[model samples]
Target: EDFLGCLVKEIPPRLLYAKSSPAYPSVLGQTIRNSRWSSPDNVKPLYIITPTQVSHIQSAVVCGRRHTVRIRVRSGGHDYEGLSYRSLQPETFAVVDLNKMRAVWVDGKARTAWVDSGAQLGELYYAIYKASPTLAFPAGVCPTIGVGGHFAGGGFGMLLRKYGIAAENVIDVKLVDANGKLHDKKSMGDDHFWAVRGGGGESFGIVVAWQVKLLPVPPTVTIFKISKTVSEGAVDIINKWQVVAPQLPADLMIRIIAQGPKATFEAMYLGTCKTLTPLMSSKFPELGMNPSHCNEMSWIQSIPFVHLGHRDALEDDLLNRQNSFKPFAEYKSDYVYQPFPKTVWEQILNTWLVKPGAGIMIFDPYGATISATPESATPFPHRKGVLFNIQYVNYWFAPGAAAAPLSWSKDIYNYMEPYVSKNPRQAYANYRDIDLGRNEVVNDVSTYASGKVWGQKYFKGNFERLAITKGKVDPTDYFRNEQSIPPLIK
Candidate 1:
């Protein structure tokens, strides 16, 4: 029987099937917002499946593969790339919404938590806080982002300096492969396991649940936000960050967030302001810190403080993190090896500030503790020798004003070219930028070079290996995006 026919008779009553059904618009539009990159005119799913059981996923995958129907797996659509639930170019696409499967189980004795990928990060945070306020998961600042995409593509947050990444703590995983069989770490094999951690999970299989090791967070974690303007030698301060931010003590993770006329130095320290004052007094204390600027709170409250397009703090902010604003948003990234000169900053102020876009730059330190871990410890390979990662986000209020922000983004990226990393010029996977070039159509790799464009930038040398994994599992290439792992030809 066909997928729709089989689902009506085969699936449990809890599952909802949308096969040429009227609920398609409501089901698909529930998560999508019209954005610059998310051109709703170009985005549509061939089918949407709301599965209540892993068995239903098995059915979708097998049937999708049999018919060469592409799959876009969605936990939550908070992805910058929209890979979880959106598509570019034409394809016979179907969406498998895992939002129904969110379930978190904590094992106090083993100090582990088996969290469903469908659960939002906020729910996980609240659950852990309810159990132990000191335990924190290393992930993105946003709450609504699905754990499925977050951990798979090398997730990180303020706790990065102390705990590393969300995937780094994943002890085990359960995914429904193309064949609809459940596979664990041992069952999926090491290559597939490595591919999911830092490598990007969308290419290999649909992850149902992840077994993550809980990390220790102090009962009192401290956060400080110090803002500086361009006239306040903000460029100089930004330049110094590439060297100092990552080198801060293991107990401290500091990041520099810069936007038009604004640059905030925010940090989460395991100790109190009394303890961090010395480091600030002696080391990069140019901001002239005082104890009044920092606030001490439980790790759970920090979620809203980080601001994920929602009111900064609340018990249920994650559920409401979905923003109802117009966004002409496009992102680009770069790796900084040397400090950006003031001349570049002046040009940026002139270029980004005057445009229809909002100039936002995030400087995250890397290559310190995380770099020293190991080459193949996880899918993320930018460890060791990496100085810092830069996420350049430019947003516009006008719908068609997309050209200005996107063009300015490229201009700023090119302006910093002289200062950033070279010879493959690394970038973070989470900040997915198709300006680097995307597959004309998903899975159309023969005409495009799998290694030439964004592949090496996002994964370094691990891309080819991930390609091999995708080829083995879904040779037909049903699950794909413009920048997804391409199937390798033997």
Candidate 2:
């Protein structure tokens, strides 16, 4: 109660939750997407602080450091590794939840929006549509994902082919330093500013809000979802997609979802179905594109269907933070520079067919705006020479089912070693995975050499530069986590 008493002076009593409070459990578990971390036996924070204002965040940082308390800032609880809320080092920590900080402001004339760290993507879309239908931001399809972590780790969406990822669109940010000092983009300077975009924001400081540049959305847009099975010649379509998707126009994005024997293809075209039909007929005639598979709607109206797969879902549905995905899931990600040969894919298909843990793979094609930019432009290095990104997911309901699926994901990862990127074998930062590497620090500073294990995989050569930036911003290593960039000083 010592730290709680100190925090109450800066934050209202209503915003704080202790273990004794009835609302503590629900608030802590609210945004946790995976049930793997939801076990009652798991360790939880001593208290949860839901800050509504920026001053409370500054106060929390100052008091937590003064009291020598380990603090975790959880924006939406969608972190795959669960590092945002859970501590693996067996230390008593406190959670700083930003759920109460949710707020969004859209400037129609400026074509930009100021989104709070706690605001979800669905809320962002709703706010943007209310202001102007023509303006939109590049973010994830998941409505419940918080803007803080999403924007920090290079968020991707349906419009990424045209406008790039969410991190690419962020123009300015309001961040509070380790000492509870506030700084904007201008005050933070170029190095610290670049580090936060795709280098993981929590490793630096608490970002209160992000100023993102909005892209132009067409008045009429088209969306489609199609299914094909292996028996129905899915291999041929997928093979062709591997070669064509990366070369397609910036206005169209067609992603593949592969299951055991069947696969689903989802697409979004910037123009109307009339134009999309003819374009697909000429470019991708193998899928047999017709008017029946397509629907015409406004860009904003299509957000729900594109992300949630709900065709008639209302705008109010986005307000619901919970989605239809099963809990107790494990996820891993990979990038394919070139499609594996037919012989290799045949072997890959068997892993999906027979398993204790069912496999579901979603592939997002990369090209257009994503590849046009230089790799050194941002900390995200998997920009050029990449065809697509693969998200491998295994879902289970039984309580003790992680062992089988955990091994299953690694087997698949090992099986694809020859076909994926080497020299570290790149992985997406947004899809957090501790299997690669993490800091095993009991106390004291995590070294720059230790972080290079996973840092190179996420940022490539940029990891060295990120370490340099971490030294300047948080030299004492106050702002850090399992896979955070280590400071050069220690």
In order of appearance, the predictions have TM-scores of 0.92, 0.97
The number of the candidate with the highest TM-score is: 2
What's the distance in Å from true for residue 9, model 1? Answer: 3.5
Residue-wise C-alpha lDDT for candidate 2, range 1-490, written one tens digit per residue: 6788789888888888888899998888888888888777677888889988999999998988887776788887889978788866566778888887888999989988999999988888888988997888878888889999988898998998998889989999999888889999999999989989988757878889999888898988999988877777777777788889888999999998877876688998999988999999999988877999998888887888887667677566577665445388888888889787876655655455466665788889999999888887889888887899988988888887789888888888888889988888899999998887897454477787789999999898899888899899888788778888888753
Question: Which number leads on lDDT?
Answer: 2
Question: Where does candidate 1 stray beyond 4 Å?
Answer: 12-14, 17-20, 37-40, 308-313, 321-326, 349-351, 354-358, 440-448
Report lDDT per candidate. 0.74, 0.84
Q: How well does model 2 score by local distance difference test?
A: 0.84
